[PDB]
Point group: D2
Chain length 388, copies 4
């Protein structure tokens, strides 16, 4: 049989994996090795695994390829390495990239500073307006780069529309699908060419692995592996990290269901609360791109942003008053995580520059975990009441 | 007390490490985490660990910094990532690098193809001739890059002399110290600015970790961390890999002593053998740069190359006749590893091009392990006798 | 705050765990150490951790204690070690145990052969009939031992009733709660004194850890630790196994929900199938002790047994015809597992002796996993159709 | 070829291990699995691995069997589990054991209290006097149990002589070889029937694994596995712990050489020091059983005990004044460990009872590590000078 034919939950559990033919071991063994041995000079020449590949990591790459409906996968040392290995494989001096402005922070630094120092220019646009992408394209544009949903207000990008635009002008579309996971969104099915994830978030899900994955056509992935990893970033994933990610992703379906069920309850609670001015969540019909979300996403996700009354000091008081939610900058973990960018990560940044970046003084971001939603709601209500 | 004051074996065991103050645990705990939590909004802003750093990996970086007599260390996903994170941190389009030609293979691809595609030009020279390095320097030269000893005939580069030349012309010297480990050679003490290793080889030593390390001044390492890793390669080392490397490096001193004691015995045996035309080993007085080796290296290393009578077919027969030595392309493991580049790794490469690269049809490379030297010698003698 | 006050899902995620006070690490660090160090002679005497305890394993023990509503937990090397460490701590030569007959196989060997060789006699009874337990009690009875649900037909034992009987006659009740997990059944809340689990099954859930847990009063657990583990079995759990179990148990709630939702669908399908003579599942109203199950269990579990038409050869053909279900003797994993005891595990056992043990020639046992239930059903239907 | 024919260092590296036939992986894969799968009903019946065995742990057991020159090995959860699994497999109510009195502490509790509660009586004797062993034997004696060298003064037991006595009277000899490792002593070669180790000490050597090993005839080991582990202690070793022990034992030869070379230097220093009244070390000719040690042990070991002038307070001051040596109760680690039993572990024990146990107020025990011996000596001298 072929796991590409089975239901998505079945694929999550089985795809890329099989019992060890040699031993019958059901768990994928951890091939924690650097060295692979040949039986003869002839076998040595023939193969020329190699530890540009590894049997454990191979299982993870094959699984994620099945889940994203792509041909092949490539695991990396971090989400940022998945992004840079991809873009540095595709681009050389003189090339151009059109990127969404609403992207993850260290992606922005790589595109803003690193790429131009290698002769690769980047134009940043508002990707919620596909016409801005079209207008920014140039004869030298190799790649359009988008993230959806995007920080910090969970705005969306119409993947199918953008893919059509990119392709008409001879560029590839790369989509960072980290926030959704393949359980909730499948960019390749909508016309994207390449998907990247930080598996650090939902794919692993257990807050104990830093890692990335790239999924795309075999022809591209081979280049990302034999040139990008081998000759540029060196960002390979360790076999133990691959094994942990394989283990975490086993529960991706049930975890995403619970994250999203919890998040919807919490988003509705926050929307009903008189001390909360705004709530950003694709699952609320008041979301600016609600209907696009319903077509493109199977679930509205586990992340919520919201603005508390009273600006900077209220937001600080609120996060200082939670008892259950944990203060941290990651997302996609089993524990509910909360952060207040204006007092935490962006405190040195000038208020008016924060504002330009969509970060208001009162904005809180919440990564909803697997706890009982009544407990998370009660904790939020407690902290909100105190802060306001 | 301060481990920088203690003997080298004491440093190998203790430097960068201490019992866990919280629990008393002697082994460095494995901080297998992606997420770090803040106790308040204020603590969050203050720190802005972060998982651009990790307590386990920090211990490894501090240890290797002590051992190389550098200020700071930075762990990476692979030896190649240590090299590319370094050079991509230092160089931008329009910059120039002078590199030894006798370098590790995937370093050569990065320098030959990847760097020029980012607008960074590289001149390759014979670094055994320091005048060639001087002659190749340009106003835009940022870095001189060397490896010593170098594949495939274990030629040397005079680190102190090259450092003086590089510095006089305003460039940094980066040295790949992988083959020696800090137990046998200390490039920073000889004037190098930056040392890189693949810890995949001797530093870990157990053939089960792919990883790299960079050691240098705090000011440089900070840039390699906060720009190179964060914004370019994303090549961070996982905490488990760091923990395994910490564990492997505990025995670095006793392992290097045994590797080198074994290697000298084997090199002398091979030098006495009438079916072996040449033996390349820094420990033999017939080595072209023997006296330089005696000043610059505390031991002559665990690697030997040698040429067997009868060219390509003899070399193939020989490696096909070993019973104890294992056929593989890595080095620095506890097991003795052997390879015949002409029939294994370089078989597709044209004979005359192999020859230009110092790879003769009969050249065998041997990574000497920790087995009884009489057993390794008996195995070699057996295979040589059969092959010739 | 106190996690004993929060909802069960919140407890599953958080109980026994907290960010590392020293570093802020959210994941419990893996304290993979044998050695703990003292700061002074005085601190050494004072503590006399010790590695009869470990910070990682402590977190697991505290979590499971919260989840079972017991005072304290003790982790072990295997489920069987949890059982034997308990019973060998409690019993000495001349003591007596009343045990259910319908128990796990290697528990039966320990009770049948090992215990009597140490002078500890065991009476086996049908624990579905509490009067049989009462009738078997003796002045020297220290322990009543039960498992519920029990193999192979998922019969039940009324925990509250049995606890009352045991206590009236001055004995402790120990319950193996492995099949249910604390998510579905809480024996201590029903009057049991001690709960044991093989965490190898649902608690870990990922088919990659062998381990056990014991939960009970602090006074008993201290004895099981400082006498049973230290001075009898030596069956301690490794910190890495504890860390993996902590990680697996994070998803216990969502996993048990899905296992049981899937199992109910499959049990109903099997009950409607004309080639299946019997289906044993607590979730079917036709189950002999259905109402007892509804009071004592919050969900009916992820395990089903059923009898296929055509006896031994039909059962063999059926398991040889599945494509998705994996043939194995474990349970509680994310993958659906299937076994046919009469042709697999009990083939050497005489047919009439198998029959006495409740194992008919046509009995199949199924551990329902997290795959799509339609896929599991389609696979079963396919194999059943072929086999019959 | 057969590793039983090779030199001991070669065996240490290679025995029990081979590249993975399926993949070529040189490192033994970590089979971190609980579940093994069958390809058919027939294969299921046939095997009835099983996770009473595991491919990773199997490699460790086979290696240690080669190194001790025994037929078979069995890994366990701890050294104490190796001991109790052995003795509870061999003995039943009514049986008798003759044991050395000078044994490891938690072995003493198991023999003194646990065994008699199961109807198994134990006679303790001074095993340095083989006549005391003979005089204590009874018709029901199944086992003679010895440790050599023994705590706390490193007295010896003549293994060959004791084996002859045990055998003449129809008993087995079990030897705890933990202090020596098979590199320094081979009890089976001297007539012992069974060897046990805590691998927690030198075999693993890295202070990060708790575990045990049993080595003996296939017929016995099968019983220890299929009855002792399966049906009594449940004390199996986890595959990750086995993998770490495999990795640690790779350097056993070079580690034991350095431990013993360091220890001899330190013992000679202490013997020359006027504030040290006694030094116990088999490598000093003043050792009461020096010549026996020279025949039975290939090296004199890495452990030293010594008495400091000034009794209890001097010993306390001394250990409170070390800067490099770490205060801990384990041994065989890469770091030098020191303890003062009278002020640390035996402080509650009455002075006259301590004295009976060979523990004087001034006795210090030292586990010599791999640091530079001059540094350890300088640290000891510093602390001794201060304390006296
Ligand atoms: Na991004
Ligand atoms: Na290099
Ligand atoms: Na049981
Ligand atoms: Na002992």
């Amino acid at each position: 049989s072929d796991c590409r034919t089975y239901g998505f939950n079945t694929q999550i559990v089985h795809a890329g994996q099989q019992p060890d033919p040699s031993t019958g071991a059901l768990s994928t063994p951890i091939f924690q090795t650097s060295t692979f041995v040949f039986d003869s000079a002839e076998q040595g020449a023939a193969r020329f695994y190699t530890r540009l590949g590894n049997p454990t990591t191979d299982a993870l790459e094959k699984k994620l390829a099945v889940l994203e409906r792509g041909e092949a996968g490539l695991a990396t040392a971090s989400g940022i390495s998945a992004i840079t290995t991809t873009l540095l494989t595709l681009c050389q001096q003189g090339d151009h990239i059109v990127s969404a402005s609403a992207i993850y922070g260290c992606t922005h630094a790589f595109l803003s500073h690193s790429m131009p120092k290698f002769g690769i220019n980047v134009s940043f646009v508002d990707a919620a307006k596909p016409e801005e992408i079209r207008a920014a394209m140039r004869p030298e544009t190799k790649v359009v780069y988008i993230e959806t949903p995007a920080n910090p207000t969970l705005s969306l990008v119409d993947i199918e529309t953008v893919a059509g635009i990119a392709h008409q002008q001879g560029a590839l579309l790369v989509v960072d699908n980290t926030f959704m996971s393949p359980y909730c969104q499948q960019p390749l099915q909508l016309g994207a060419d390449i998907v990247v994830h930080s598996v650090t978030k939902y794919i692993n899900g257990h807050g104990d692995v830093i890692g990335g994955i790239i999924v795309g056509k075999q022809e591209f992935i081979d280049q990302a592996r034999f040139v990008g990893l081998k000759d540029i970033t060196g960002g390979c994933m360790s076999p133990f990290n691959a094994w942990l990610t394989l283990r975490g992703v086993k529960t991706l379906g049930i975890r995403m269901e619970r994250h999203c069920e919890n998040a919807l309850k919490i988003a509705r609670f926050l929307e009903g609360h008189p001390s909360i001015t705004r709530v950003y969540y694709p699952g609320l019909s008041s979301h600016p791109q609600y209907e696009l979300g319903q077509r493109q996403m199977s679930l509205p996700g586990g992340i919520i942003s919201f603005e508390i009354a009273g600006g900077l000091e209220a937001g600080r008081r609120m996060i200082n008053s939670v008892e259950l939610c944990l203060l941290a900058v990651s997302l996609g973990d089993t524990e509910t995580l909360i952060q207040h960018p204006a007092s935490m990560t962006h405190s040195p940044v000038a208020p008016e520059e924060r504002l330009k970046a969509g970060i208001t003084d009162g904005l809180i971001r919440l990564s909803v975990g697997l706890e009982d939603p009544e407990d998370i709601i009660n904790d939020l209500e407690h902290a909100i009441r105190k802060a306001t």
